[PDB]
Structure formats: C-alpha cells, structure tokens
Design an enzyme around this catalytic site. Structure first.
Site, short mmCIF file in Angstrom:
data_model
loop_
_atom_site.label_atom_id
_atom_site.label_comp_id
_atom_site.label_asym_id
_atom_site.label_seq_id
_atom_site.Cartn_x
_atom_site.Cartn_y
_atom_site.Cartn_z
N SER A 158 21.94 -1.97 -75.28
CA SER A 158 21.87 -0.51 -74.94
C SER A 158 22.28 0.40 -76.13
CB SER A 158 22.85 -0.33 -73.76
OG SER A 158 22.13 0.05 -72.59
N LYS B 128 19.53 2.89 -77.71
CA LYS B 128 19.29 4.19 -77.00
C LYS B 128 19.67 5.41 -77.87
CE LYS B 128 19.56 1.89 -72.73
NZ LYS B 128 20.25 1.82 -71.42
N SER C 154 24.29 5.17 -69.83
CA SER C 154 23.50 3.93 -70.12
C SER C 154 22.49 3.63 -69.00
CB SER C 154 24.53 2.81 -70.22
OG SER C 154 24.07 1.83 -71.13
N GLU D 262 13.39 -2.18 -71.03
CA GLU D 262 14.56 -2.58 -70.21
C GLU D 262 14.03 -3.32 -68.96
OE1 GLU D 262 17.50 -2.40 -70.95
OE2 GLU D 262 18.08 -0.57 -71.94
N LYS E 185 28.53 4.38 -78.53
CA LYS E 185 27.50 3.83 -77.65
C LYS E 185 27.68 2.30 -77.70
CE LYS E 185 24.34 3.23 -74.97
NZ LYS E 185 25.05 3.07 -73.67
N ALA F 223 25.85 -4.61 -73.96
CA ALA F 223 26.24 -5.95 -73.44
C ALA F 223 24.96 -6.69 -72.95
CB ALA F 223 27.18 -5.66 -72.26
#
Ligand SMILES: OC[C@H]1O[C@H](O[C@H]2[C@H](O)[C@@H](O)[C@H](OCCCCCCC3CCCCC3)O[C@@H]2CO)[C@H](O)[C@@H](O)[C@@H]1O
Length: 265
Positions: free
Chosen positions: A45, A48, A105, A141, A209, A212
């Site tokens: 993430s 982003k 997120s 995603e 930011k 995981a």
C-alpha cells in the site's frame, strides 16, 4: 540504541528475513544510511503515495480535477474499503479517493484511482517518465500484495522509492499546491501516523505511508526530522519473515529509535 546500520543487521537476524532501508536527505538527496538499497521488495500500500503523485500530475496538466466525482458500483469494491463502501450512491471525488487511499489505505480507492492513470502500466510509464526505471506496478488491489518470493512484479527498491518520493515532493515536476497536497495526505495518515507520534520524542515531525503483504511483508515510507521539520526520507521494507506483526512493528520502531539516537551523521 546501537548504530542504525548495526541495529538494522540485528533486526534481520532476529526476524529471519531480509530488510531493505535507506535514510536520505530530503533537500540534497544524499544517502546517509543504506542496507539492501538496490534489492527489490514488494511496495504494498506504499505505492498509493506514488499513485496519487501521478494523479496530481494530471490535475497539473489540466487532464484531471481533484473535484471530479467518480461513481462506482458495489461490484467494483475489493477487500478492505473503509470509506469507499460508505459512498456507493453519492460517489467520491478524485481528491477524496486519494485521501481514503493514503490516510485510511482504502484498497478500492486505489483501484478507482488506478483506472484514471491508465492502470498499473500507465503508472509504471509515469515512473519511467519521471526518472524511475526500476519501480514497476503490475497488478491491481489486492493481488499486488501476494509477495511471491523471487517475483519482481509490483516491486521497488529502497533507493528507488526514496529518490521518486523526493522528486515528487521537491522537484518542480509537481506544482506548489499539488506538492503541498501530497505531503498533507501523508501527515494525515490515520493508520500508523498517530501511533508513531504517540512514541516519538517531542519536536519530531512525522508523515508516512506504511504497507503489509503476505509472507511477513511490511514497509513504511516516512518524512522525519527534529525541530518539527521534515529533514530526511526513511524507507524500510521487510520481506520473507514468519514473525508476528507486533514483532515486525517492534523491529521497525527499533531501527527508528537508533536513527533518532544517532541522528547527527
Ligand atoms: O535522547 C533522545 C530521546 O530518547 C528517548 O526517545 C525515545 C523514545 O522514548 C522512543 O519512544 C522512541 O521509540 C522509537 C519509535 C520508532 C517509531 C519510528 C517508526 C519509523 C518512522 C519512519 C521511519 C523510521 C522509523 O525512540 C526514542 C529514542 O531512543 C527519550 O524518550 C527522549 O526523552 C529523548 O528525547
């Protein structure tokens, strides 16, 4: 407590996995510390912030507006959409999608923004056009978090992500208001921002930011510095470790404690 390079080595031998880190000067871009800086790690993430950077580049070129409202269907939602699921009838603006994607997120917010920059390939072309020839986005995603060992898909290296983040927050490639907006989304992260500020000594600025993925993958991209000013960019990635999230979180806080204790270098 120990020198930051020796502590980073202890974290890797205690986590039984590979750690990648780079401490860089934001103003000049000089690298102060680096471990496995040229080795690949899954972005997760953290891509982003770079994704919203390409979004502000289109608004700067008059091709996008952070006010434009995008409407989507429930069928467009993927796992983990804390704010985008609450707006299936009213939709959300491009600026709101970038806020939900970086501070909360939201995974569906990132896919919805991905479709405006031309997919992960449209975002890799913007990275190459900006001087990054290693970072690459391949899936959407949440398939880009799989973290398959030996797979270069959806990865970067600590040296590359740090140099691209510096280019987006200090080069003239992004207009002043756009650069001001990207930084604000980062200091407004409601996932780890307040948790880190809670254990940081007073007078230390923080914007970040984190990420995981599977196989113990964990990462953080942050702006840190004493005297309430962002002085350095720190990028730490974790991969291929069976350790619990708490111990992975405690290992990253341990490298951050060595950076603050030996700041002057
Ligand atoms: O002498 C310097 C300081 O040492 C301690 O501060 C501690 C602190 O008590 C602790 O809570 C933190 O944990 C570190 C938390 C790590 C969080 C950073 C996470 C990321 C951020 C971006 C990438 C790097 C690490 O370390 C320092 C330094 O030892 C003292 O508490 C404090 O009075 C003092 O000002």
């Amino acid at each position: 407590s120990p020198q930051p390079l020796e502590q980073i080595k202890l974290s890797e031998s205690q986590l039984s996995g590979r750690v990648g880190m780079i401490e860089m000067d934001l103003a000049s871009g000089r690298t102060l510390t680096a471990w496995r800086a040229d080795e690949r790690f899954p972005m997760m993430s953290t891509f982003k912030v770079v994704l919203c950077g390409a979004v502000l580049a289109r608004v700067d070129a008059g091709d996008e507006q952070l006010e434009r409202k995008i409407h989507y269907r429930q069928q467009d939602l993927v796992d983990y959409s804390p704010v985008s699921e609450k707006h299936l009838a009213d939709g959300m603006t491009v600026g709101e999608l970038c806020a939900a994607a970086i501070t909360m997120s939201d995974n569906s917010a990132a896919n919805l923004l991905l479709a405006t920059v031309g997919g992960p390939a449209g975002l890799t072309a913007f990275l190459r056009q900006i001087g990054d020839n290693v970072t690459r986005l391949d899936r959407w995603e949440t398939e880009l978090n799989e973290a398959l060992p030996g797979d270069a898909r959806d990865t970067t290296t600590p040296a590359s992500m740090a140099a691209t983040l510096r280019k987006l927050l200090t080069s003239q490639r992004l207009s002043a208001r756009s650069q001001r907006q990207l930084l604000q989304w980062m200091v407004d992260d409601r996932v780890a921002g307040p948790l880190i500020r809670s254990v940081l000594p007073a007078g230390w600025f923080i914007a970040d930011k984190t990420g995981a993925g599977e196989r113990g993958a964990r990462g953080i991209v942050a702006l840190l510095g004493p005297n309430n000013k962002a002085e350095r960019i720190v990028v730490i990635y974790l991969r291929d470790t069976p350790a619990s999230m708490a111990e992975r979180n405690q290992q990253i806080a341990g490298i951050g404690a060595a950076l603050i204790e030996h700041w002057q270098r």
